[PDB]
Design a protein around this ligand. Structure first.
Ligand SMILES: [Mg+2]
Length: 202
């Protein structure tokens, strides 16, 4: 599906870049973009999700709020409610141009609608359950099963991986096409704490 023609067109849809100091914590996830006017063509980009409610930082087409289950937090820029609980914090999903070695994040506004579908769930589950400090240098994509632990495959994995790789990052998910494969949220948590795939030397 990868079109470098569609990516370049909608690059002028990117406006107002800025560099921020490091958030207290965050997580990075991919979003897969298609236009109706260009059937067959897709391109990915990245969102970094940080603490605090900052709708003013979003393009107005992304200024929608989704809720975690039972009134336990929310996230701006995500288009569908999240079927598990959060940690009582509202977050904001910002388009991510670059995460730097010092922790700074360069973000931008983008003329586009919010992230739809369930692929943001794996990063969100990790953000509210497992990440306390810093932003893992990894891109997470996957739907979370009703048991709240098992990860389920999503659409557009190869588009997501290209978007991750363009930013110098590995893609993390449950399915073929990712760089590190995690069956469930414990494993993805253990990956975060390890810093990389654990290494076996014979
Ligand atoms: Mg999907």
């Amino acid at each position: 599906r990868f079109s470098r023609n569609l990516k370049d067109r909608l690059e002028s849809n990117n406006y107002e870049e800025m560099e921020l100091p490091p958030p207290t914590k965050g997580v990075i996830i991919p979003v897969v973009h298609t236009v109706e006017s260009a059937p067959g063509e897709a391109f990915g980009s990245l969102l970094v999700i940080i603490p605090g409610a900052y709708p003013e930082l979003l393009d107005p087409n992304q200024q929608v709020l989704s809720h975690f289950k039972n009134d336990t937090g929310c996230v701006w820029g995500i288009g569908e409610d999240i079927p598990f609980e959060g940690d009582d914090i509202c977050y904001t999903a910002l388009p991510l141009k670059e995460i730097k070695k010092n922790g700074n994040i360069v973000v931008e506004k983008v003329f586009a609608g919010p992230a739809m579908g369930p692929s943001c769930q794996l990063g969100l589950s990790l953000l509210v359950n497992d990440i306390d400090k810093g932003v893992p240098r990894m891109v997470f994509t996957g739907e979370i099963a009703n048991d709240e632990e098992t990860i389920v495959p999503i659409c557009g994995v190869d588009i997501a991986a290209i978007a991750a790789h363009e930013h110098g990052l590995p893609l993390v998910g449950c399915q073929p096409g990712v760089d590190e494969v995690v069956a469930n949220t414990s494993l993805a948590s253990h990956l975060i704490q390890s810093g990389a795939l654990p290494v076996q030397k014979a």
